[PDB]
Design a protein that fits this description.
This is part of a larger assembly, with eleven copies of chain A. By secondary structure, chain A is α/β, with parallel strands linked by helices. Chain A has helices at about 10-15, 30-45, 60-75, 90-95, 125-150, 150-160, 165-175; strands spanning about 5, 10, 20-25, 50-55, 80-85, 100-105, 110, 115-120, 120, 165, 180. Bound molecules: magnesium ion (MG) (11 copies). The PDB classes it as hydrolase. Keywords: csgid, alpha-beta half sandwich, protease, chaperon, cytosol, hydrolase.
Chain lengths: ~180, ~190, ~180, ~180, ~190, ~190, ~190, ~190, ~180, ~180, ~180
């Protein structure tokens, strides 16, 4: 369990310095917590940068798109910093940070790919969910193309299967802006 | 559990000497393949004589079932179908695909038609491939029913969107069977 | 497991005397076995009575209606004999024996009631299955009215809940014709 | 199951039938099939019904009991170990003067067990039925034992175990036998 | 897990001081009742000020959800709804039932509408009672959506027969929300 | 881990805040735990002010009859009027507690479902024991029905007939049956 | 307990009867057991008559690659032509065995589904061990593709591209792809 | 289930092929499966000591003690036991294959043959861990020596090549010395 | 279980070959015993060939087999065909003098008995005492058949002790290691 | 968790951080939060990172490793029990000249574990990635130990356990300390 | 657990530390944290370490042993129930002259337990390592008991159970203590 300082828990103390963590999978709970923290920080000061550290294998697309929209929505710039892994919705959040303020530590791993899903039921219902998952796939691809500056087709091609990049490769792909090794 | 008759046979083996075959319970690879084996056997014994295929099934796997349908249409002998209890999903498809004029049901049978079920989990690309395939199959099954019942394809499509239960006399008016028979005497 | 005589199993030996057993629940397997035996017996001789002993708590309506239709369909009269319990599809099979040849031993229990079922899913699908189960209920009631000579309404009223009768009460209701205590 | 056909079929050829283990639809029906079959082979010769059973389903058991009374042959009963619940009912329902027990057997009588979950209306219905069954079971015992109904009602309120001689004194069996060579 | 702010509050308690309330995850008795409590509280603090109800929910129990809908319409303050991720089943119903003109969604939200689910097992009589009830409720829910979206009832009925997914801009054209907002600045 | 929580200045949550205003919630199934919580709150409010009305919001599928009858009795027992408000479902013991609110102070919001029906139970055991519990569940069925008859004003026979199976009512039908007094749609209205 | 069964005059079932006519079935998943049964039957038929064709009916979703390749090899190995008939599904190893039937003697009934795709596997362990099994599953993927390329007449590259994901074909499309030679609808036709 | 052939004397398919001195190891090596093979071998020898026996193998391997008994029996009985791989021969499976009669070890063209070291392990006291560790090391060395002898490879080469799972196609197996011939068709 | 002109085990039984294969339990032990008694009925003076591939198992069941081997007239020769550990290695060593065989690749293991009791101190004491008696008798049986001193056996069975076939011969657990039938 | 706030927070006030038990996203993030926080309080004072860990998730661990290099303060590391897998990587990545171990500690290095089930194409992709990760992990160790890459590759093929002095000799730590009072 | 501060934190104000129950990473690390803290508060004052434990993980437990040897304060140990496996090794590793046991305690010693599943190669590595560990703990026992290594080895082959008086005689503790006043 979490350490206390001065009386805050450790994460509360960092929140005081506008530092937010996404750690582990993206689900409704973890997404909402991040969103509440971002809204809180904007309330505290709508002009100061926020620092959003990411270490996530991804998870639920709808939960994650909420976090992503909240980032574009609030007034403060949201700088992103990958501190281990950003895959699936992880990489999308990372790449959706404020322009020029997307970072990774040197040894992180970044992974992009297409949506996973599935429905059992009537042919009719499978059609409906298959069409919708196809729309979602196209729209995630368009968010990646926008943030990376890659062509849509390039994004499509590169997400067909699990695509793993080191920090330096992700910066060259446009998923982030800087690899940082030292505070200095 | 199956009683024996004597030079010893089980009850089903004995009824098979009279060209009676059953499909009972779920359509799966095991049960469908058994029927196919019997039909091939019956054809081998006599190419001309009717076969009597008693059906009481909630349906099951489409591919397994379609093997039985193709075998019925394939072999020389006429396969007469008789519903005895239930024919639903692939069950009613097999019922409807019996020899022209030789599709029967006992008075209390329930007959149900509807669209295929399935679904996959996986990458969106995989889900797309399987979605398209289930659509082709849904289409092909409706065309089978249209052909055997005499209904328009569009009518079939409308009527199988959700589960559709029919009494024996309604299934006859619909074209899924030819005769409702209540008495061997009649 | 089952005894051998002379080489038959015990049930095979009785089948030689046109005796068929329904024992335990009605399902696709037990129903089909009975049906195959009835068809077999008619094949052997289409004019001799068949004796169909019942001890069943009932079970699946579609499986059971097949057995019932097969009884009315084949040429031989099918006499019925309750030897313990006939409830649900059990009582319906018993009562559907050949006119004047429906029997029970003195201590049997006979039970009638309405259909049980259920579906989870969309409102639309629940409607479809609710309508169908209502048709089935009405038609079972009409089979009982026919065989007992009771009014439809009487059958409806008396099957609303589990209705238990001793052998003598079932004979007075018309579910059977005779209570027999001794072969003589 | 030794071959000699199995051992039980060899004994069936000498008009010997076993009820061993619980009464359920399967074990009860098997017995009924053996009784109808013995009647069919010879309608006048005695039948020998060996019972070792903790009992079980009432309806399945009552079918066996009724068949015993229905067929022409006398069904002589013999307890070999335990006759409890439906077990003691079948033992006691044997042919007059021909109910036996090996000496170390236990015989237990008691009231029906059951129960339903659901609406009160349905519980009431099932309560009334089991109460009827309770009563009929008592009357069957009063009949085969020669005991007053009131006595049976009282003696079956809770589990009641008897040794073989006690079951004889009570009217559940006619004889305790120790040796075949004894008259 | 919920961070604290200082005289100490959890993050949600703090946002509640700004009249922000969340419904997140499934609608059940627990989550619905929490929202109701907050709405009653917010009304008590100030009867006139807008409340901002952020929704991200796949839906859930109809009765629990309808308590939240009635409470929104009941209390003095306007409840403004903002979809942030997903609004489906009861979720989209709550979204659509926000104050007139004050129903929003972020650009990437998915909004889905459809008919109720349920079902009972039991006696046919019981199944009939519950079947009729689910039909009344299905009807009442469609009438709620018709009223808030401005669509004809018949249109609603057609469009909720099966799951119906909409992007934010489609939900606005449909009437489920009033505005798509991408930027606090705009 | 309660929510949302203002700490002491183990925590002060939204329910404790509302309880400060004599607002009590029964949410979810009625069992020994949830019933006793309500009782404790009712007694405490009576202790703070005997005169002032209490507002009892109900959203419940019901549950255990004994636990529920403690709540019903407590409501009648304490000095304050206990106003009932249905905010989603009042089924089984739920609907009984709703109907047992102070006279003329029983409310529902417009979309609530109110359901009445007979008790459910069950016992496995000896015939004797089944007889005993069968008689008892019938006395309780009778008592529950008498309670509803008293608060609705229907005849007992009417209650009996209407509860033989699940009986769903909308809020307006509940008012016309006498289970609540007012359907309220808006605070200002 | 086999079916349906004529005893000796442990039993003589419908499959044994049909085997008397050189008819063999692969039904359901391909595993060590089901594959070996087919092999045994094939060897036995070769022993009874080396010259006479064998009729191999397939209805299978496929399964284990090693077990399946024994069947494929045995078919090519024995003297008799082995005719293949698809009677429902030939997927995965199923479709391979179908395509591997004697030249010009590979059939499907009209409604069959034929599916081809790449192998599936998986290993948990040390990087080294994952490397080894990864290389191997790629050699096998290559071999499977070469087999289909040989029997269909497609170029290897075509096979590779067409099997990257599940690829469903109707019977007539399977014939045009070269996986079977004839779609047969009627015995007399 | 297993088909039947009548002569009336009914036997299952496997018994019928046994009349032609054909034996199958199919699936995992364990006490039950190894023993049946051994019983058959003993039976075939008694029936005719001189005639070759055909041992078809499709096996992922399994229990080493069970396997070594089959192996010892092959070497022990008078008749030559010819081995044919039909699918897979891994672990004890490849050992049994390779241990067939000199020049009469076959595989079909698509078989995979895999060799590697033994697996096991005990849980308990350090003393027992030690005892079992020493044993499994002897067994590892013995197994290696056995392959070396049948393949003709030198011991060190075997050791190097079995440190991790090592998968071979049939032709690579012939070249390694695990089998003598790859056969594609009966006529050739 | 293949059929040859009954099963292959029944066929090899016609030649006085018996297998213990897999663990020693009641069922598996009784089968062996039954076959020993049968082979004796058939021919009292003819040798029996007892094949062993066993991890051992239940001591009491095993001792029944061991005793039966010494009780019947026929010499029971033992052949280890893979593994003989625990009771397995005891049955191997208890074969007829000079007729104990192993194939070359067999593993043979001896150790002390394992057991378990939970309960009262008194009951633990009683069972502890008895397993110690049994440990002792087993060491005595091995000492007698090996030629080894009791104290050597005790030292050597304190923990699992694995021997290759030639080690077991040198130890005295078998008499011969055989590689080919002709030799 | 004793109060003095808990014991770990009291020590955090003296710039002491613990990694205890497996590395996963949760335990790794906690540490990172403590490192960013100490940097924030005082960017020049040394940090004391106590490690007792069997290791765990590579990505979670690499985040901790990177943060250690990124922050201004020197992160001095101390092994207190075990440092295996990611544990020995974090210990070894400590500030030059300031990597310590209590004397009885075990230090274990080895290659990555993983694996995927699925199509060959996907297995190939995951195989290549873990091979890259294997390599980078080796290069990190070669860097902090001063060892040749080839040496690391060979010494991590299988589990490799070292005692504290062996880990020092190997370059994984700088000092084995026994007493605080010792210089 | 009661509040006075919970009860344990209260006793910690007097430099009392409990190890109670199994030795694992969590319980071991708590103890180490308390040791370092107490050294921080006063580096000269004795610490009292009560031990009631069946033992458990060696690596976790040797962390505690080393921390005891390493901090400036003397660590006195007191067995109050059971000290088996790693438990008895912590008890025995107390400050010289300050190892106690209450009169009814059981102390037990024996060799380590473990064992891997896998390839022979891997089994051999973990076997060799557990044999080192075994020898190492044996030397520690010999060191603190004053016993010869051969003796420790012989006596820990199987579980060895001693009463408080037997343990003191064997050298695992210095004093059996029955009443605070005496
Ligand atoms: Mg922004
Ligand atoms: Mg035809
Ligand atoms: Mg008739
Ligand atoms: Mg009689
Ligand atoms: Mg409002
Ligand atoms: Mg009051
Ligand atoms: Mg060929
Ligand atoms: Mg040889
Ligand atoms: Mg002897
Ligand atoms: Mg640094
Ligand atoms: Mg010290």
């Amino acid at each position: 369990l979490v350490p206390t300082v001065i009386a805050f828990d450790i994460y509360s103390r960092l929140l005081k310095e506008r530092i937010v963590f996404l750690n582990g999978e993206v689900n409704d709970h973890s997404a909402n917590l991040v969103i509440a923290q971002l809204l809180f920080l904007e309330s505290e000061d709508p002009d100061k940068d926020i620092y959003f550290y990411i270490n996530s294998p991804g998870g639920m697309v709808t939960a994650g798109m909420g976090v992503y929209d909240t980032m574009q929505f609030i007034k403060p710039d949201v700088s992103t910093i990958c501190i281990g892994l950003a895959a699936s919705m992880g990489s999308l959040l990372l790449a959706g940070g404020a322009k020029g303020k997307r970072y990774s530590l040197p040894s992180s791993q970044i992974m992009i790919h297409q949506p996973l899903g599935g429905f059992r039921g009537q042919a009719s219902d499978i059609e409906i969910h298959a069409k919708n998952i196809l729309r979602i796939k196209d729209r995630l691809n368009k968010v990646l193309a926008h943030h990376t500056g890659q062509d849509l087709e390039t994004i499509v091609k590169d997400t067909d299967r699990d695509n793993f990049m080191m920090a330096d490769e992700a910066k060259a792909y446009g998923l982030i802006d800087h690899v940082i090794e030292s505070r200095e």
